Design an enzyme around this catalytic site. Structure first.
Site, mmCIF file in Angstrom:
data_model
loop_
_atom_site.group_PDB
_atom_site.id
_atom_site.type_symbol
_atom_site.label_atom_id
_atom_site.label_comp_id
_atom_site.label_asym_id
_atom_site.label_seq_id
_atom_site.Cartn_x
_atom_site.Cartn_y
_atom_site.Cartn_z
ATOM 1 C CG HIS A 73 35.180 76.316 14.141
ATOM 2 N ND1 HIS A 73 35.342 76.281 12.772
ATOM 3 C CD2 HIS A 73 33.886 75.993 14.374
ATOM 4 C CE1 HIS A 73 34.195 75.956 12.202
ATOM 5 N NE2 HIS A 73 33.297 75.775 13.153
ATOM 6 C CG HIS A 91 29.024 82.282 18.094
ATOM 7 N ND1 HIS A 91 29.773 81.168 18.353
ATOM 8 C CD2 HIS A 91 28.493 82.096 16.845
ATOM 9 C CE1 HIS A 91 29.737 80.344 17.339
ATOM 10 N NE2 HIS A 91 28.961 80.888 16.402
HETATM 11 FE FE LIG Z 1 29.128 77.651 13.814
#
Ligand SMILES: [Fe+2]
Ligand SMILES: [Fe+2]
Ligand SMILES: [Fe+2]
Ligand SMILES: [Fe+2]
Lengths: 307, 307, 307, 307
Positions: free
Chosen positions: A246, A199
C-alpha cells in the site's frame, strides 16, 4: 489511547450462510471458534489474542457489518467516554453485559458516517490460544490455514467525514495518522490511530452511508502473505488484489472475499507512528499510488465493491 | 502511556574513540549523523524516526551509558511528571533547553538501580530521513550498512529492581509486560512496556548498580537479521550471539559490540501486548530457554559482560 | 553428470531405536514413511522427491551410515560405470534388484576413505507426495514438522581424500566445486558436485575411516530454517549449531541430532556452480570462517562429534 | 547437459535508446557494464556469473532479441554439436572468435520457431564480480538496485513448436521439464531444461516466428522480489504483473519493461527436476491458473505484448 481506548476488540459481520462462513474463517483464516449463541451467533478469536473473542458471525439476509467495538482500559474510562458522547450530542445505546456471551456492557453509538461503534471495558480473559501462561513457546502447534495473528482494523466508506473526524479525535481520543487531501486541502480519507499502529480504524468518503470496505487481520511476514495467497488459489477463494504494498501505511497486503462477499484483508508490517508525529500525507493526484504502491493505478473494483 | 510517556527518545553512550565508534554506528548500523556540539559529541538518528536524534556519542575514558531519555506527549505532562517524582520523594535534576543541541528542557532523575533517566517534552522535528512528507516512498534510497529502522530499547543491569518497579509503573506510568521469577516467587527481571512493545526498557538484577547490558536497534525482518550477521562478519565486528530468538519477548536477535565494547542488539519481530494483558512469566529453572529459545542454555558473555 | 550420475538417490542410516528415530524423521523433519522391509528396515522420502524413498532406517547396535546411493540416468550408464569401477581395479558388489524393497539392481563399492557408495539405475517412481500429476498445486496440504524438501547431500569424514578424489572425478564423473587447502597446499576438504549444486557429497580429512558427519535435508527459505529451529526447542531436540551461514557453499544451516546421535543438517540457499567454474578455495588459517561465517570460529561438536 | 550444453550464456537485445537502456539494466537491475565495442554494443553481466558478459545491448530502431547463446563444456562438444547440426540438415553460421569481444567462436542457427540460437565454448573467465577467489564473502558490497543474481532464461513465442522440440531434445540434448497441452493433447508450450532448472528456455505457441516474450534474471528470495517491486515503483518503471506465483514452475515472479518495451522478468525459487522426472503437465482448461497461480486469470498484456 488518549482517552482510554486501547484497540479494536470485536466486529460483528453478517453472513448469508453460516456453514460457508465457518469453513472460510476457521479453515482458511485460521480463526479459532469459541462460543455459540441463544441467537445462533458464532464467536471466534485469533490466537495471539488474550480475550474470549474478536469476530462474531451472524446469519442474515444481507452481508455487511453490524458494529465494531473498541476495548477501553477500565470502567472509569467507560463511564467518562459514555458521558462525553452524550455530552457531545451522540445518542448512545446502553448494551447490557451478557447480551454478547462473555462480554461486559457496551455503549453503542452511531457515527455520522452511518456506522455503529461500541466501547467496552470488560471481556472474558481466556489468554493466548494454545499456549501456557508460564514459559510459553513461540506459537501453538496446530493452527490452521493462514493462522491470522489478530483482528487488526477495518476500513469504512462513509458520508460525513468532518463530523466523524471530530467525534473520534475530540471525544474518543484517536489521533490522525495518515490522510489524503485534494487540491483544496479536503480530507478524502483519514487513518486514525489509537497508539502506534498506522491505523485502528479508517474512513474514506462515500455517497452512501454505512458501507464496509474490508475487515483486516494481521499476518506476520511477507512469506506468510505468499503462503496465504497459495492457500487462496488452493481453496479457490476469490481474490481482489494479490500480494502487493500500500502507498498509505506502506504495509503489504492481499484482498480476498468470503462466501458472503465481505472483503477480508490480511496484511503485515506497515509503518509506525506516535501521537507527536505529523500525519503522513498523500494527495488525490497520487490516488493510484496511495492505494496501490507498485501499480500506481486503481483497481476498478477497489472503489466500487462494498458490503 | 498512562502518565503520558510515549517512547525512549535518546541515550547517551560513552565511547573511547569517536572515530572508530562513528565508523561503527554509521557504516555498520547505518545510523545518520545529524549534528555536533562544542563539547565534542556527535548526534545520530535512524531514518524512520521523526526527531533530530536518538543517539548521542560522547568520547570518554570508559564506555557505558550516561542517561536514557523518554519523550512525553506534551509540556503539561512534563510538569505533572516532574511534580509527581518530587512527591514520590525522588530528587529531580533540571537541564535547560539547549544543553543538548536541538533538545528542549529535561527532567533528569536516578532510578534506585543506579541509572539516570530523563523525560523531555520536545526536540527538533526533522521528519523521516531521506523521505518526502507528501506521497512518501516506502524507504530512502541511499542507506548504509544494516539500515537500522529505529532505536528500540535498552536493558539495564542493576541493584534495586523492586523499588525501580514502583518508580516506573507508579510514577512514570509504564506497565509490566513480562517477567521472570525465581523459586521463591521473587521477580528477578522485569520487562516494562509503555504501549504495545514487549518492552521499552528492562531491568535485570545485578549486585553492582549502573551497568548497561545493551542498547537495541530495531530491524524489520528475519532476513534483515541474516544480512546484519553477514555484515558483522564482513566488517569483522565482534559478535556475541548470532541470528537466534529469545524465549522472553520471542523476538529474533543478534548481539554484537562497538569499538568501545558496548553491546548493541539488533532485532526484529517480538510479541506485542496491551495494558490489560497479563504478564507472561518465565522461571529461573527455564532461565536458559528464557534468554535463548533455540539452545536453551546460557552464554558466558551474555550474563557477565556489561558496561 | 559427466558420466550419467544424477543425484544422491538414498541413504541407509543405523538407528538405535526405530520408534524414537521415526518420531524424529516423520514428526520433526516431516519425511513420509513409505514402506517397511520384511526385516524391520523402514523406508521414508521427502515430498518433492519423485521416487519411492531416499532414507532407509534400520536398528543396529551403533549409529552411522551403511551406504549412500546415487542414481544414474539409465541401465547402460550403470553398466559402463560398473565396467569402469572393475577395470579401475575396484572390488564391486552387486546386489540383486529387490534386495531393497522397490529398488532396482545395485552396484556397491567402498571408497578409499572407508565409506560405502552405490549406483543404481532405477527405483519405483511415485511422483511428488500429495500432488497431482496434472495441474499440480504449489505444495501438499498436510506436511508435518519442517517438511524437508529433499535429502540433499552428506558430509563424510575419511582418510584417503586424494584416492577418493580420483575415484569420484575420473571414474564417477563428479567435479569439485569447492575445497579447503592447508599451509603446504594440500587439499584438506573436497566438495564434489554432479551438476549445479555446491556439493552432492563431500569429504573432510579424518584419521579414522568410515565416519559419517551428517546427512542433510533441504529446506526452502531462511524463515523455514527459523521455523525448523523453533520446532527443535518445542520438541527438545539436541541442537548442535543454530541458524547460521557457512563460508563454503555460503548456505544457511542448522545442525541437530536424531535420537541415536546421528547428525542432521537442515539448510537452504547455498551457491551454485557449473563444470566450468574454478573451484572456490578456502584456506586453513580461515577455517573458523570457512565453516561458521558469522562467528568465524569452530565449535567442539562440529569437529569432535562424528558417527 | 546430455550433450555438453550447460546453460544460457548470453542474449543480445535491441534497444531504441542506449542511454536509457543502460539506466534500466545497470541502475534498476544491478547489472555490471563490462565492455563496449566498435559498433556501440555494450556488454554487461550479473555478479554471481563467472564469465565476462551475459547481456549485450545493441542500439537498433526496433526492440527485440537478435540471438540467445548457450555455453557448452568444451571445444570438443562444440565441434560435435556443430557436426550434428549440419548432419541434421541445418544451415549453420560460423561466427569467428572476437566477433563478440572476449568471446570465442560461435555456431549460430535459426530454430524452426524463427529464433536464432548460439553455441560457444570460450569466453574470457572473469570470476564472480567483486569477490576475491580465495575465501570469498557472501556478497559484493556495491550492488545497485535489484542486484540481479544471474541471467536465468528467456521465454519465446514461436510458431514450429514440434520441430523445435525435436531439434532441442534430439540435437541439443535438452529435456522437457514442464509442458501444457490442449484438449487434443496438442503440446501448446514446452519448458526445456539442461540440468536441474525448471527451464533454461521455453516456447509458447504463437502464429508468429522470432518473437521475444521476456528475458529473465534470477533474484534469490521472496523479500528480494518485494524490494524489486518497491524500486520499480520508485523509478516509475512500467510494471506488467506484480509479485505473484506462476502455476508452471511455481516460481515467484514480477514482469516489467525496459525503456524500449522489451519485457524483463525477475523471479525466485521454481521447482527443480532431473532427467528422470516425468514432465509436469498443465492442461489449457487451467491455463489461467497455469500462468497466474494466485489470480487464476489471464492478463491481456501477457499474451499480447511481444518482442
Ligand atoms: Fe486495510
Ligand atoms: Fe534487548
Ligand atoms: Fe552440509
Ligand atoms: Fe519466466
Amino acid at each position: 489511547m488518549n482517552k482510554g481506548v486501547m484497540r479494536p476488540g470485536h466486529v460483528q459481520l453478517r453472513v448469508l450462510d453460516m456453514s460457508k462462513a465457518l469453513e472460510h474463517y476457521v479453515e482458511l483464516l485460521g480463526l479459532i471458534e469459541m462460543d455459540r449463541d441463544d441467537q445462533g451467533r458464532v464467536y471466534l478469536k485469533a490466537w495471539t489474542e488474550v480475550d474470549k473473542f474478536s469476530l462474531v458471525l451472524r446469519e442474515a439476509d444481507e452481508p455487511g457489518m453490524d458494529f465494531m467495538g473498541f476495548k477501553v482500559v477500565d470502567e472509569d474510562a467507560l463511564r467518562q467516554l459514555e458521558r462525553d458522547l452524550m455530552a457531545y450530542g451522540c445518542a448512545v445505546e446502553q448494551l447490557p453485559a451478557g447480551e454478547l456471551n462473555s462480554c461486559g456492557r457496551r455503549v453503542r453509538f452511531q457515527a455520522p458516517s452511518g456506522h455503529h461503534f461500541e466501547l467496552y471495558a470488560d471481556k472474558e480473559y481466556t489468554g493466548k490460544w494454545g499456549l501456557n501462561d508460564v514459559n510459553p513457546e513461540a506459537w501453538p502447534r496446530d493452527l490452521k490455514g493462514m493462522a491470522a495473528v489478530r483482528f487488526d482494523h477495518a476500513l469504512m466508506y462513509g458520508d460525513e467525514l468532518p463530523a466523524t473526524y471530530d467525534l473520534f479525535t475530540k471525544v474518543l481520543g484517536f489521533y490522525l495518522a495518515e490522510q489524503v487531501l485534494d487540491e483544496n486541502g479536503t480530507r478524502v480519507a483519514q487513518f486514525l490511530s489509537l497508539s502506534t499502529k498506522a491505523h485502528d480504524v479508517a474512513f474514506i468518503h462515500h455517497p452512501e452511508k454505512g458501507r464496509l470496505h474490508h475487515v483486516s487481520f494481521h499476518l506476520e511476514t511477507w512469506e506468510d502473505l505468499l503462503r496465504a495467497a497459495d492457500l487462496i488459489s488452493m481453496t479457490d477463494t476469490s481474490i481482489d488484489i494479490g500480494p502487493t504494498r500500500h502507498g498509505l501505511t506502506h504495509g503489504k497486503t492481499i484482498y480476498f472475499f468470503d462466501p458472503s462477499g465481505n472483503r477480508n484483508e490480511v496484511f503485515c508490517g506497515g509503518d509506525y507512528n506516535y501521537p507527536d508525529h505529523k500525519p503522513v500525507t498523500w494527495t488525490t493526484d497520487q490516488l493510484g499510488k496511495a492505494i496501490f504502491y507498485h501499480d500506481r493505478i486503481l483497481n476498478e473494483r477497489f472503489m466500487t465493491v462494498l458490503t
